[PDB]
Amino acid sequence: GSHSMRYFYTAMSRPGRGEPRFITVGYVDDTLFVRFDSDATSPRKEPRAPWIEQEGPEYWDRETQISKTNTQTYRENLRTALRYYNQSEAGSHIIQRMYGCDVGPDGRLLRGYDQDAYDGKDYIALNEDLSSWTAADTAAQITQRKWEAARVAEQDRAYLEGLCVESLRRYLENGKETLQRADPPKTHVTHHPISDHEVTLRCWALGFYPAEITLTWQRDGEDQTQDTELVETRPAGDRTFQKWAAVVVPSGEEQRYTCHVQHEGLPKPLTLRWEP
């Protein structure tokens, strides 16, 4: 179906403890495929998925050089951000960047991204049009002017409409056995009495890929949003994800409740009940 490629940068300053750590992780959908860490013994782009390993030595050289130069770039950015925000040199600060492309089922660009954040706050983001910028404040507006003057948007768009979609297309073909395979959740309902009058119904989804899923409880066919306890989707460690949704129900009313499951690996949404 639809697929995404994203690279994630984190640059973290640590005054008194050496130069800022720079890390890059790259993903196709929910699959990590490459990493770089400047704190590695001999830092380089490293394969994290079997399907990327068949890129020749030139791929790795070029990708490694990109990250090594990025290490320097983001260290400068950190120094610059400090000046733009009148901050002291004694504090730790973080720059994050996300960028990448989404493609549709036919592999055409759906949309591009390139967003930066400073200390967890929006800094600057390429707009959806891939030709203008949104700056979060007067500090980011300085970077915007520099980037406007240097035609950075035009170079992002060249990448996003070309290399981004083409490499993602190649990765999807090479990893087609996994990247283009959806695993539907394994699902069950468990029953946990809290007290005499109340019981917990917990609806589980295990073993699914990708992470996107919807799990909801109904009572007499009515959504129980404000009553449902919903945990964050969590990795199992085998590429798959887990989720549950719980409700507290009155004793003897269990059959009024149904759990509803939507996942791209399921032809039709599932309906479950407690099965005593």
């Binding site: 890059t24 990109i66 990250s67 130069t69 950015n77 610059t80 960028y99 520099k146 490499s167």
Partner: peptide, 9 residues
């Protein structure tokens, strides 16, 4: 594949 975005803040 990445690209080198070389322009700083």
């Amino acid at each position: 594949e990445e690209y080198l975005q070389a322009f700083t803040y």
